Amino acid sequence: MENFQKVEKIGEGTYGVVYKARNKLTGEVVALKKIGVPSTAIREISLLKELNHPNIVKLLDVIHTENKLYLVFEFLHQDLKKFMDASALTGIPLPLIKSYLFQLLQGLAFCHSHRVLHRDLKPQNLLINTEGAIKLADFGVVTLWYRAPEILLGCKYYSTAVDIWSLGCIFAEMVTRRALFPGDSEIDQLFRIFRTLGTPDEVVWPGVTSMPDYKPSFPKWARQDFSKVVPPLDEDGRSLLSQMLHYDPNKRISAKAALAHPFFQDVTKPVPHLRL
Numbered sequence: 554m555e556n557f558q559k560v561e562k563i564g565e566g567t568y569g570v571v572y573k574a575r576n577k578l579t580g581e582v583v584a585l586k587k588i589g590v591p592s593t594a595i596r597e598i599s600l601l602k603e604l605n606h607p608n609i610v611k612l613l614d615v616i617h618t619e620n621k622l623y624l625v626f627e628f629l630h631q632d633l634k635k636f637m638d639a640s641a642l643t644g645i646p647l648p649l650i651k652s653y654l655f656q657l658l659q660g661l662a663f664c665h666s667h668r669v670l671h672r673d674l675k676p677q678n679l680l681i682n683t684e685g686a687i688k689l690a691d692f693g694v695v696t697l698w699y700r701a702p703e704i705l706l707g708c709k710y711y712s713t714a715v716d717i718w719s720l721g722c723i724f725a726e727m728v729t730r731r732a733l734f735p736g737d738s739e740i741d742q743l744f745r746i747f748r749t750l751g752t753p754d755e756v757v758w759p760g761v762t763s764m765p766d767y768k769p770s771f772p773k774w775a776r777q778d779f780s781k782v783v784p785p786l787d788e789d790g791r792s793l794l795s796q797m798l799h800y801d802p803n804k805r806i807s808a809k810a811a812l813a814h815p816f817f818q819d820v821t822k823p824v825p826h827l828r829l
């Protein structure tokens with residue numbers, strides 16, 4: 554727009570490029586996302602500027618000019634991926650990990666209550682500020698690391714449970730300082746999940762053998778010990794995590810239910826120490 558002047562390219566998303574820009578009018582710095590334009594979609598996005606939550610990056614404005622679509626979001630100073638890389642030496646403190654997980658579950662609970670899912674949760678689209686907050690951003694070579702199993706198996710009508718899986722993967726990563734399922738292809742992704750949680754069957758996941766991309770020929774791996782998977786997460790944390798990583802989407806814990814888990818008994822809001 555004629556009112557915004559780009560400062561620098563923040564990066565490349567999947568729905569277009571994102572730029573850090575200054576609003577020549579308000580003088581504010583924002584995150585500018587550049588994407589005729591489908592009308593059905595216009596009404597959709599117009600609905601995003603409506604669902605506001607403390608843990609959802611605010612969509613300040615939606616500019617639709619010359620068949621171009623510009624989404625103006627609030628600017629946050631860092632993403633979780635960066636913070637985690639900067640904390641690789643000692644890891645993010647548990648209290649802060651617990652605080653971020655809680656906040657993200659809150660944002661998700663809100664999203665899901667309005668039948669809105671993220672679909673592509675990952676460290677790169679989780680934004681944080683100096684205050685100690687974390688927010689969901691960029692709603693739905695792309696990473697497959699946080700992709701839920703029903704998605705990898707071809708379920709077209711997946712549920713809000715896919716976001717819980719992704720968050721579960723992010724939660725484990727914050728704790729061990731290592732991606733849980735770092736696949737580099739759908740099948741590799743799938744098998745890495747199978748090797749760790751065991752190949753799903755009709756017993757733990759009824760209806761799994763009737764999934765679009767399910768192959769009767771998939772190898773049959775045994776489920777690995779969870780204490781070996783996510784140490785030194787305490788029993789409450791591992792208990793919560795296992796419930797977020799259930800194969801059966803219907804058995805997987807909901808965001809609202811997860812907030813009441815014992816793990817958050819002693820949850821606080823620590824302030825992050827970050828370099829900008």
Ligand SMILES: NCC1CCN(CC(=O)Nc2cccc3c2C(=O)c2c-3n[nH]c2C2CCCCC2)CC1
Nearest residue numbers: 564565566571584626628629630631632677690691
């Ligand atoms: N970490 C940046 C990559 C992942 C996220 N995308 C796509 C996307 O949809 N980003 C955003 C959507 C709404 C608000 C923001 C961003 C976004 O990227 C960003 C925002 N506010 N602050 C930032 C950055 C600050 C510097 C470190 C990287 C994040 C760009 C590449």
